[PDB]
Design a protein around this ligand. Structure first.
Ligand SMILES: CCCCCCCCCCC(CCCCCCCCCC)(CO[C@H]1O[C@@H](CO)[C@H](O[C@@H]2O[C@@H](CO)[C@H](O)[C@@H](O)[C@@H]2O)[C@@H](O)[C@@H]1O)CO[C@H]1O[C@@H](CO)[C@H](O[C@@H]2O[C@@H](CO)[C@H](O)[C@@H](O)[C@@H]2O)[C@@H](O)[C@H]1O
Ligand SMILES: CCCCC/C=C/C/C=C/C/C=C/C/C=C/CCCC(=O)O[C@H](COC(=O)CCCCCCCCCCCCCCCCC)COP(=O)(O)O[C@H]1[C@H](O)[C@H](O)[C@@H](O)[C@H](O)[C@H]1O
Ligand SMILES: CCCCCCCCCCCCCCCCCC(=O)O[C@@H](COC(=O)CCCCCCCCCCCCCCC)COP(=O)(O)OCC[N+](C)(C)C
Ligand SMILES: CCCCCC(=O)OC[C@H](COP(=O)(O)OC[C@H](N)C(=O)O)OC(=O)CCCCC
Ligand SMILES: [Zn+2]
Lengths: 487, 30, 263, 232, 73
């Protein structure tokens, strides 16, 4: 009876226990936090065992009243899509605890409080069918990320970085809130099952689609609004910055799948070229911007921006394979970008430069880090045999089947992906060794070596045999694509 | 050492104990 | 009356229950806590048969441990943590001195070199914080720096400041008007009249400062509680309501320091 | 381990509840003798699971504050004002040695500065006045000068007499029968035989003198002063 | 979850919250902790009962208002 309620309660118990633990007992704080995170991960994994990937309706649901007339209420559940996101969210956080394990004495227990709070917070986002409360938890993640960026930021310029990441989010959040109010006042409720079965007005469809796009175009970096991610992402702690591109970047893109595509069937079709003309030029402009960059963190963030703009093309291209490929690409990106930021943060925790000019010739030393970095660069390099290529090949297939022009521009993205990532790899860990700057340096010890092991095994597993991921959600994608129309 | 010998505190103490008795009765009798 | 008797009986019952519960809580700890017990530390004890003859005007802090035959003159004072151990030979502390905080005075066992003499301190002599005097023979009106480490056989003359943190070696004589410091003898400089005035004024300042510490450290329980309550009552002032009520509140004399110790 | 600390905390909770009940009962009877400022010092202060072990034949001064895992050998004296603290690791004090007035022993509390080194004191070690041994091992039959500042990692081996005011640097062994003094500890000369005998002679005399104090410092409380303090 | 374990836990939590917000060790006075547990349980139970009563006496009044509106024709 491993229901969804316990999956959210366990991080809450972990946080509550940590609150009343003295700061001196640094031995116990890290142990109990890591144990709580791992129990949450196992409790998420066991859900995959009892998933029952057969029904079109939703899986285990928990209903808790929220208004006196049961008008709108906490209504949990997963269908076929948020399950993998829940699993990956539960898996990334223990890595966050492990990476920031050595320096926990300075961080204190407040470091784990924020991470566990955000943990069950993002857990409650993906499995939340009620539309309004999905927005409550959708913007609830502002506070933990604000605190993580500000309190434990690397450099002093973190003050300006957090303001953009906050206000850009609030603007779109309230723009969406207005649409939510319009929908609730018109329909009457915000439950997802009912609200998907309401005849809307075409003139009303376009306005509400635009209102949702006001914020969902900020979470996924679009052409007009993508400045926040690099500035507010290079300036975050490695344990914290690894989930801005890990789970905090998948809200809006996944929010399109659950609250835009089946919600507004007649508006996405009318706005399809606009999304194409935004994302196709995004994958070009951001990729070109990536080349002339010097900071080690910003290049990975820009590559992440390009990957999200690519997955947006395959998501709005309504195909049974386009959406599945979008989900595979999003999971693969969540793995690879997380791994890449850990790889570029372990360098910072030893030398504290964040400049490619200083780094050079790191193959003559720390070869294990060089091998890991090369593998994850190849994964970002979009090679077949890794989970990414399975990710964007289906995107290209779905785009080309609908529009021929958009597929060529999208594949220009994976052509241009070999210009910055390979250049970074050859300019950081394969150059000429310079003893003037990097006087001394060690290699990865047992902690960061074990950190990349789950990443590597999951990468290979989902790259060579992505059947189980596609097997578990073919029904849900089929139901999502076929909606509103009957032919 | 057999009497508190304070003709002001004892009334306060008996008031406190009768208040406690009243509280427990009010919880019980209602 | 009878109500008072009943309340006293209830108090005894409550006290017994509380003591029993305290005992149970102590047992649950595994008896891993050392009980507080009582202050066994005693000032002015007898080492073998000889008592320290301390004058009436002397201030001896309760934390001090003045043992052995110690002769202390009028007007002088012994401060907190200081140890006047005089087990073997007499320690004739003069009148008007001040053995300051955490200072140690010890005397060798008449055989450190074969011609050992008891420690003697003159008059109007300041010793300083955490000094170590082991067999010295300080004479009247001499300055000792804080943390000094005067070993045996040393004699400091009048007005012969030892620098703080010094390590005056064995049988080292400091001439009057000279300032010696550092690990070796290491003469620094001559005396100045500003400095002699400073020495005299500091010596008299500690004498007219010691009596307030002497009075405060020797207040009865029924008196210290009264002073604590009075200090709490007059912690802060309020001229508004004082003027509106037509009254004035003056601090009690027992809460006012004498004007000699104010800057 | 962790479970023992939980029971220790519950013991504090129950002890304070009983203490508060005692205070309420005493105050209800019209007595306020619990508000005194009595010095709450214990000469054998401990932590959860250290409980300093002292030999019965040893002598510890009332002003001494033995804290932590301090072990005291047979016949050694623990004089007035010494601040022997042994919380992190063991502090073994040898048999027949002495720790003079206003001295102390660290264990280098903070674990940041590498690994904490336990303090070891040999037999018949005439530790001097105002010794500030900062968690260093000291072998048997040696003398430590007054005002010495031994730091962690120092191995003062046998007969390694240390001059007064020394500041021997960390992890610098003192050669046997060789004196080190000054700032910092530098070679001065070699130890002589009359001082070699004098070290043990002083140790024996100090042990006997400590026995005399312990005989006379364990005298009953002399309630005359108890009545004197109350009657004021 | 029985409207009493949540109440007792919330009362104990706010007791430690008040105690530690003054920069004191969390378990200063256990007796006020247990009375806080009791008060939290009582308040939670009464809050649940008051919510049930509020809904019950709100439905019977909303019905009256709707009936009064329905007599327009
Ligand atoms: C602030 C932190 C919040 C953290 C927890 C949030 C989760 C809250 C859910 C926990 C919880 C307590 C609420 C705690 C409030 C905290 C107080 C804060 C201050 C404390 C210092 C509410 O859970 C239920 O409570 C019900 C109350 O109405 C509501 O059900 C709706 O009500 C209808 C009304 O018309 C609606 O029409 C309808 O749609 C729903 O049926 C819902 O709120 C919910 O279903 C647990 O349920 C508790 O409520 C009831 C029914 O179970 C029980 O009492 C009952 O009384 C008799 C008939 O009442 C029964 O004969 C008897 O059998 C039973 O004993 C309790 O024993 C307990 O079970
Ligand atoms: C194994 C054991 C298991 C464990 C056993 C567990 C047992 C549980 C027992 C719990 C006892 C409950 C006690 C309730 C405690 C209430 C608070 C204590 C109140 C209290 O200060 O005392 C009286 C006051 O009096 C009342 O003004 C009003 C106070 C009236 C309330 C007193 C009621 C006490 C009767 C308790 C029942 C008696 C039953 C006896 C039980 C023992 C039988 C053998 C003394 O005043 P006071 O002026 O001298 O001084 C007070 C006091 O110092 C502070 O409050 C302030 O600093 C000061 O300003 C002043 O107010
Ligand atoms: C298309 C993707 C397919 C999957 C990717 C794996 C394919 C191979 C990718 C890795 C190839 C090796 C590249 C490693 C980095 C090269 C630079 C480097 O860092 O060298 C390191 C690492 O050396 C290696 O090359 C290790 C190679 C390990 C890779 C072996 C696995 C390849 C086969 C796996 C393919 C998957 C099989 C199918 C799975 C179902 C040390 O070399 P040294 O000779 O010691 O010189 C360093 C100088 N100094 C001694 C002074 C320190
Ligand atoms: C069962 C134990 C009752 C013990 C009653 C008791 O000790 O009251 C004292 C405390 C605080 O009062 P004082 O600051 O004067 O403590 C003065 C000093 N700490 C003293 O102990 O006297 O009362 C409470 O907070 C409890 C309120 C809720 C009470 C139910
Ligand atoms: Zn001596």
């Amino acid at each position: 009876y491993f229901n969804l309620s316990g999956l959210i309660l366990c991080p809450v118990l972990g946080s509550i226990i940590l609150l009343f633990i003295p700061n001196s007992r640094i031995r116990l704080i890290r142990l109990i936090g890591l144990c709580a995170s791992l129990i949450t991960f196992l409790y998420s994994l066991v859900l995959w065992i009892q998933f029952d990937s057969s029904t079109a309706k939703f899986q285990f649901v928990e209903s808790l009243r929220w208004l006196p007339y049961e008008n709108i209420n906490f209504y949990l559940g997963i269908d076929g899509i948020s399950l993998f996101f829940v699993i990956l969210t539960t898996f990334l956080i223990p890595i966050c605890i492990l990476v920031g394990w050595s320096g926990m004495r300075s961080y204190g227990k407040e470091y784990i409080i924020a991470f566990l709070i955000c943990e069950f917070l993002m857990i409650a986002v993906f499995c939340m069918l009620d539309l309004l409360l999905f927005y409550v938890f959708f913007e609830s993640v502002l506070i933990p990320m604000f605190i993580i960026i500000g309190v434990w930021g690397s450099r002093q310029r973190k003050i300006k970085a957090a303001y953009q990441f906050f206000l850009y989010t609030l603007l779109g959040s309230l723009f969406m809130l207005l649409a939510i109010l319009l929908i609730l006042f018109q329909t009457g409720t915000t439950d997802l099952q009912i609200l998907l079965t309401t005849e809307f007005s075409e003139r009303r469809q376009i306005f509400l689609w635009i209102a949702f796009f006001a914020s969902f175009a900020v979470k996924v970096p679009m052409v007009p609004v993508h400045i926040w991610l690099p500035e507010a992402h290079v300036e975050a702690p490695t344990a914290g910055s690894v989930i801005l591109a890990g789970i905090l970047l998948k809200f809006g893109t996944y929010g399109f799948l659950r609250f835009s595509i089946p919600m507004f069937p007649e508006a996405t079709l009318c706005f399809t070229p606009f999304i194409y003309t935004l994302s196709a030029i995004a994958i070009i402009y951001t990729s070109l911007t990536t080349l002339r960059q010097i900071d080690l963190k910003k290049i990975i963030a820009y590559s992440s921006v390009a990957h999200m703009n690519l997955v947006t093309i395959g998501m709005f291209s309504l195909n049974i394979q386009g959406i599945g490929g979008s989900i595979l690409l999003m999971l693969s990106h969540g793995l690879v970008s997380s791994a890449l930021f850990l790889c570029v943060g372990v360098l910072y925790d030893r030398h504290k430069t964040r400049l490619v000019r200083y780094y050079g010739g790191l193959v003559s030393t720390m070869p294990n880090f060089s091998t890991i970095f090369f593998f994850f660069t190849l994964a970002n390099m979009s090679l077949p045999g890794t989970s990414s290529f399975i990710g964007e090949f289906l995107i290209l297939v779905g785009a080309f089947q609908r529009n021929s022009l958009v597929a060529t521009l999208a594949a220009l993205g994976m052509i241009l992906g070999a210009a910055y990532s390979l250049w970074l790899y050859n300019r950081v860990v394969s150059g000429n060794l310079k003893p003037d700057f990097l006087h001394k340096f060690s290699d990865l010890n047992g902690r960061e070596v074990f950190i990349f092991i789950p990443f590597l095994v999951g990468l290979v597993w989902m790259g060579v045999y992505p059947k189980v991921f596609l097997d578990c959600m073919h029904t849900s994608v089929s139901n999502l694509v076929q909606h509103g129309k009957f032919h | 050492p057999k009497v508190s010998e304070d003709k002001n505190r004892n009334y306060a103490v008996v008031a406190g104990v009768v208040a406690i008795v009243g509280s427990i009765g009010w919880y019980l009798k209602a | 009356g009878t109500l008072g008797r009943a309340i006293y009986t209830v108090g005894n019952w409550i006290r017994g229950t509380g003591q029993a519960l305290d005992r149970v809580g102590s047992l649950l700890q595994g008896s891993h806590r050392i009980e507080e017990h009582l202050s066994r530390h005693r000032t002015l004890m007898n080492v073998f048969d000889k008592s320290p003859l301390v004058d009436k005007d002397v201030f001896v802090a309760p934390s001090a441990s003045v043992i052995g035959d110690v002769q202390i003159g009028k007007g002088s004072s012994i401060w907190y943590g200081c140890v006047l151990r005089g087990d073997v030979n007499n320690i004739s502390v003069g009148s008007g001195t001040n053995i300051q905080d955490n200072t140690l005075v010890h005397v060798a066992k008449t055989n450190i070199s074969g011609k050992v003499l008891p420690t003697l301190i003159g008059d109007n002599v300041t010793v300083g914080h955490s000094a170590v005097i082991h067999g010295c023979t300080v004479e009247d009106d001499a300055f000792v720096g804080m943390g000094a480490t005067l070993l045996d056989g040393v004699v400091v003359e009048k007005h012969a400041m030892v620098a703080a943190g010094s390590l005056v070696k064995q049988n080292t004589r400091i001439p009057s008007g000279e300032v010696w410091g550092g690990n070796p003898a290491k003469f620094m400089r001559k005396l100045t009249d500003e400095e002699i005035v400073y020495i005299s004024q500091s010596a008299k300042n500690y004498i007219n400062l010691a009596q307030i510490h002497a009075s405060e450290n020797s207040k009865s329980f029924e008196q210290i509680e009264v002073e604590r309550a009075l200090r709490k009552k007059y912690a802060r002032k309020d001229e508004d309501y004082d003027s509106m009520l037509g009254i004035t509140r003056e601090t009690p004399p027992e809460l006012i320091l004498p004007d000699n110790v104010l800057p | 381990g962790t479970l023992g600390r939980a029971f220790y905390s519950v013991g504090f909770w129950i002890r304070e509840t009983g203490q508060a009940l005692d205070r309420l009962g005493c105050r209800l009877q019209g007595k306020n003798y619990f508000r005194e400022q009595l010095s709450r010092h214990r000469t054998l202060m401990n932590v959860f699971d250290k409980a300093p072990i002292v030999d019965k034949e040893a002598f510890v001064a009332p002003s001494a504050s033995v804290i932590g895992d301090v072990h005291i050998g047979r016949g050694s004296s623990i004089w007035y004002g010494c601040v022997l603290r042994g919380d992190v690791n063991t502090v073994s004090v040898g048999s027949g040695t002495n720790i003079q007035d206003n001295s102390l022993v660290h264990v280098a509390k903070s674990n940041l500065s590498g690994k904490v080194h336990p303090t070891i004191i040999g037999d018949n070690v005439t530790i001097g006045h105002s010794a500030v041994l900062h968690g260093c091992t000291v072998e048997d039959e040696t003398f430590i000068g007054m005002g010495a500042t031994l730091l962690d990692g120092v191995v003062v081996e046998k007969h390694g007499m240390v001059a007064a005011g020394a500041l021997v640097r960390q992890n610098t062994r003192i050669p046997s029968g060789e004196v080190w003094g000054g700032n910092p500890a530098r070679f001065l000369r070699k130890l002589t035989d009359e001082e070699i005998a004098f070290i043990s002679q002083s140790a024996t005399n100090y042990s006997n003198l400590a026995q005399a104090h312990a005989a006379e410092n364990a005298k009953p409380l002399n309630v005359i002063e108890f009545e004197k303090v109350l009657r004021k | 979850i029985s409207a009493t374990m949540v109440g007792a836990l919330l009362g104990l939590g706010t007791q430690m919250y008040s105690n530690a917000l003054r920069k004191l060790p969390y378990m200063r006075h256990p007796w006020e902790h247990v009375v806080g547990m009791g008060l939290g349980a009582v308040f939670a139970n009464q809050l649940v009962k008051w919510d049930v009563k509020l809904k019950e006496d709100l439905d019977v009044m909303l019905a009256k208002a709707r009936a009064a509106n329905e007599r327009r024709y």
